[PDB]
Design an enzyme around this catalytic site. Structure first.
Site, mmCIF file in Angstrom:
data_model
loop_
_atom_site.group_PDB
_atom_site.id
_atom_site.type_symbol
_atom_site.label_atom_id
_atom_site.label_comp_id
_atom_site.label_asym_id
_atom_site.label_seq_id
_atom_site.Cartn_x
_atom_site.Cartn_y
_atom_site.Cartn_z
ATOM 1 N N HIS A 9 0.841 -1.377 -0.113
ATOM 2 C CA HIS A 9 0.276 -0.099 -0.126
ATOM 3 C C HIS A 9 0.896 1.537 -0.014
ATOM 4 O O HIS A 9 0.284 2.326 -0.545
ATOM 5 C CB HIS A 9 -0.979 -0.026 1.177
ATOM 6 C CG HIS A 9 -2.147 -0.782 1.145
ATOM 7 N ND1 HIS A 9 -2.728 -1.191 0.141
ATOM 8 C CD2 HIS A 9 -2.406 -1.881 2.057
ATOM 9 C CE1 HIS A 9 -3.831 -2.120 0.354
ATOM 10 N NE2 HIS A 9 -3.362 -2.616 1.481
ATOM 11 N N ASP A 55 -3.006 -11.181 -1.661
ATOM 12 C CA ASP A 55 -3.515 -10.434 -0.209
ATOM 13 C C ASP A 55 -4.832 -10.222 -0.762
ATOM 14 O O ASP A 55 -5.564 -9.851 -1.784
ATOM 15 C CB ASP A 55 -2.780 -9.104 0.128
ATOM 16 C CG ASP A 55 -3.191 -8.710 1.295
ATOM 17 O OD1 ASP A 55 -4.394 -8.055 1.576
ATOM 18 O OD2 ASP A 55 -2.333 -8.840 2.364
ATOM 19 N N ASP A 73 -4.667 -12.846 4.481
ATOM 20 C CA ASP A 73 -6.153 -12.069 5.025
ATOM 21 C C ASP A 73 -6.989 -12.902 4.236
ATOM 22 O O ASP A 73 -8.126 -12.505 4.526
ATOM 23 C CB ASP A 73 -6.022 -10.771 5.071
ATOM 24 C CG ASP A 73 -5.331 -10.179 3.935
ATOM 25 O OD1 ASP A 73 -4.696 -10.761 2.864
ATOM 26 O OD2 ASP A 73 -5.234 -8.926 3.896
HETATM 27 C C1 LIG Z 1 -12.704 -16.071 16.956
HETATM 28 C C2 LIG Z 1 -12.965 -15.142 16.724
HETATM 29 C C3 LIG Z 1 -13.048 -13.525 16.752
HETATM 30 C C4 LIG Z 1 -12.124 -13.018 15.883
HETATM 31 C C5 LIG Z 1 -12.636 -11.535 15.454
HETATM 32 C C6 LIG Z 1 -11.812 -10.432 15.604
HETATM 33 O O1 LIG Z 1 -10.863 -10.146 16.356
HETATM 34 N N1 LIG Z 1 -11.964 -9.214 14.568
HETATM 35 C C7 LIG Z 1 -11.505 -7.877 14.629
HETATM 36 C C8 LIG Z 1 -11.721 -6.599 13.871
HETATM 37 C C9 LIG Z 1 -11.149 -5.548 13.693
HETATM 38 C C10 LIG Z 1 -9.933 -5.405 14.734
HETATM 39 C C11 LIG Z 1 -9.029 -4.056 14.403
HETATM 40 O O2 LIG Z 1 -8.422 -3.533 15.299
HETATM 41 C C12 LIG Z 1 -8.739 -3.084 13.198
HETATM 42 C C13 LIG Z 1 -8.857 -1.879 13.075
HETATM 43 C C14 LIG Z 1 -8.797 -1.027 12.218
HETATM 44 C C15 LIG Z 1 -8.580 -1.465 10.684
HETATM 45 N N2 LIG Z 1 -8.629 -0.470 9.807
HETATM 46 C C16 LIG Z 1 -9.112 -0.789 8.463
HETATM 47 O O3 LIG Z 1 -9.826 -1.830 8.023
HETATM 48 C C17 LIG Z 1 -9.045 0.032 6.982
HETATM 49 C C18 LIG Z 1 -7.614 0.026 6.570
HETATM 50 C C19 LIG Z 1 -6.809 -1.507 6.755
HETATM 51 C C20 LIG Z 1 -5.332 -1.807 6.083
HETATM 52 C C21 LIG Z 1 -5.227 -3.396 5.870
HETATM 53 C C22 LIG Z 1 -3.837 -3.701 5.559
HETATM 54 C C23 LIG Z 1 -3.518 -5.061 4.744
HETATM 55 O O4 LIG Z 1 -3.789 -6.131 5.105
HETATM 56 N N3 LIG Z 1 -2.827 -4.720 3.336
HETATM 57 O O5 LIG Z 1 -2.473 -6.247 2.637
HETATM 58 C C24 LIG Z 1 -8.721 -2.714 10.642
HETATM 59 C C25 LIG Z 1 -8.830 -3.752 11.722
HETATM 60 C C26 LIG Z 1 -9.449 -6.432 15.388
HETATM 61 C C27 LIG Z 1 -10.063 -7.876 15.339
HETATM 62 K K LIG Z 2 -4.586 -8.266 -3.832
HETATM 63 ZN ZN LIG Z 3 -4.126 -7.276 3.368
#
Ligand SMILES: C#CCCCC(=O)Nc1ccc(C(=O)c2ccc(NC(=O)CCCCCCC(=O)NO)cc2)cc1
Ligand SMILES: [K+]
Ligand SMILES: [Zn+2]
Ligand SMILES: [K+]
Length: 358
Positions: free
Chosen positions: A134, A171, A264
């Site tokens: 990214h 990814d 992922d």
């Molecule tokens: C068994 C059982 C249950 C298990 C469920 C569980 O634990 N669910 C869960 C959901 C969320 C969280 C987050 O703290 C969290 C916060 C903020 C974000 N930001 C974004 O999405 C937008 C941009 C992201 C960049 C991606 C980079 C990438 O990968 N490039 O390849 C994402 C996640 C932690 C856990």
């Molecule tokens: K991809």
């Molecule tokens: Zn990703």
């Protein structure tokens, strides 16, 4: 030209999110991967390769001297200065050791590029964080500071006289950074299969649709396979690789394959929402070995279920080492939504690749 390279240094675990102890991009991602590679006996079968810091000359291959200096200026910032700078970016945290680890993350890939392009190793895998696909020329994005693979593609072109590089991004997120850096370059073919859902999935960009086939000289050298329904399984990716990527790959005839090896999209990932078994990545890795004389370098991108990501790396590592392909529990028949996305992408790339005119 034998052996499989493995690059891992503890500096990958020496940076984390200070204001959020539950941030998914954590040091436990790469440490859990190394544990499973050791317990499964795969780590001992690899040729351990040491990492190296990326020079300002190499970093300047895709970035700007201004942005590189600002990122270098982050190791001496206080937490309030790291947070106020991170907030200027989209989905990014910072840490005084972030820049240091990012430099070893970039150089870890180039180390494997050296050993592979000189026929010292058959293939390689860097177990690195932070991710990279990214990162853009003058900004951080999506937990990335520097674009590891975009640097490696240009590095291999300059340092190793490579003319055609293939970048495969499996990814679950569209690597819009790599797409932007090579939007008009026909010497670096970028393929990305990713969750899209018509744009309702991050990064919520129209440029992630299949109609962004690159521009100028690179018209037709950017292939986006956007999913629009969650729950994609192994048969959807195998069909995708067999009917879209691999036909274009053999016609493109690259001399180096770089994989944005995020995991992922595996079962159980908290972000991907996909239903791909880890054993599927043994099949996808195996397909990519028939191209470019098997000169294949993988680098960790996403993957936030600690168990799912380690299983995906292990499944990929077995194909790299030449182990037999696994039995896949899922059905080899793709679903209708996947065939719709595959068909639409074949249409958007039909006039640029004769292997698709069918
Ligand atoms: C068994 C059982 C249950 C298990 C469920 C569980 O634990 N669910 C869960 C959901 C969320 C969280 C987050 O703290 C969290 C916060 C903020 C974000 N930001 C974004 O999405 C937008 C941009 C992201 C960049 C991606 C980079 C990438 O990968 N490039 O390849 C994402 C996640 C932690 C856990
Ligand atoms: K991809
Ligand atoms: Zn990703
Ligand atoms: K391109």
């Amino acid at each position: 030209m034998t052996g499989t390279g493995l690059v891992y240094v503890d500096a990958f675990t020496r940076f984390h999110c200070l204001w959020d102890a539950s941030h998914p991009e954590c040091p436990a991602r790469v440490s859990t991967v190394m544990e499973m590679l050791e317990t499964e006996g795969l780590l001992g079968r690899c040729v351990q390769v040491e990492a190296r810091a990326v020079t300002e000359d190499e970093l300047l291959l895709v970035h700007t001297k201004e942005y590189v200096e600002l990122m270098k200026s982050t190791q001496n910032m206080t937490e309030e200065e790291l947070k106020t700078l991170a907030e200027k970016y989209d989905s990014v945290y910072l840490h005084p050791g972030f820049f240091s680890s990012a430099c070893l993350s970039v150089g870890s890939v180039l180390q494997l590029v050296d050993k592979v392009m000189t026929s010292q190793l058959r293939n390689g895998f860097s177990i690195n964080r932070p991710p990279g696909h990214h990162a853009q020329a003058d900004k951080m994005n999506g937990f990335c500071m520097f674009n590891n693979l975009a640097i490696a593609a240009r590095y291999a072109q300059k340092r190793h006289r490579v003319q055609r590089v293939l970048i495969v991004d499996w990814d679950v997120h569209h690597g819009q950074g790599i797409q932007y850096i090579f939007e008009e370059d026909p010497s670096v073919l970028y393929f990305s299969v990713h969750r899209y859902e018509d744009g309702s999935f991050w990064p919520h960009l129209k440029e992630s649709d299949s109609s962004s086939v690159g521009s100028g000289a690179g018209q037709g050298y950017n292939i986006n396979l956007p999913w629009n329904k969650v729950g994609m399984e192994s048969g959807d990716y195998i069909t995708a690789f067999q009917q879209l990527l691999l036909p274009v790959a053999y016609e493109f005839q690259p001399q180096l394959v770089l994989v944005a090896a995020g995991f992922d999209a595996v079962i159980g990932d908290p972000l991907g929402g996909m239903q791909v078994s880890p054993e599927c990545f043994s099949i996808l890795t195996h397909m990519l070995k028939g191209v470019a004389q098997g000169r294949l370098v993988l680098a960790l991108e996403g993957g936030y279920n600690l168990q799912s990501t380690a299983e995906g790396v292990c499944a990929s590592m077995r194909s790299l080492l030449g182990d037999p392909c696994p039995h896949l529990p899922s059905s080899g028949a793709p679903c209708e939504s996947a065939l719709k996305s595959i068909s639409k992408t074949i249409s958007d790339l039909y006039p640029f690749w004769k292997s698709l005119q069918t």
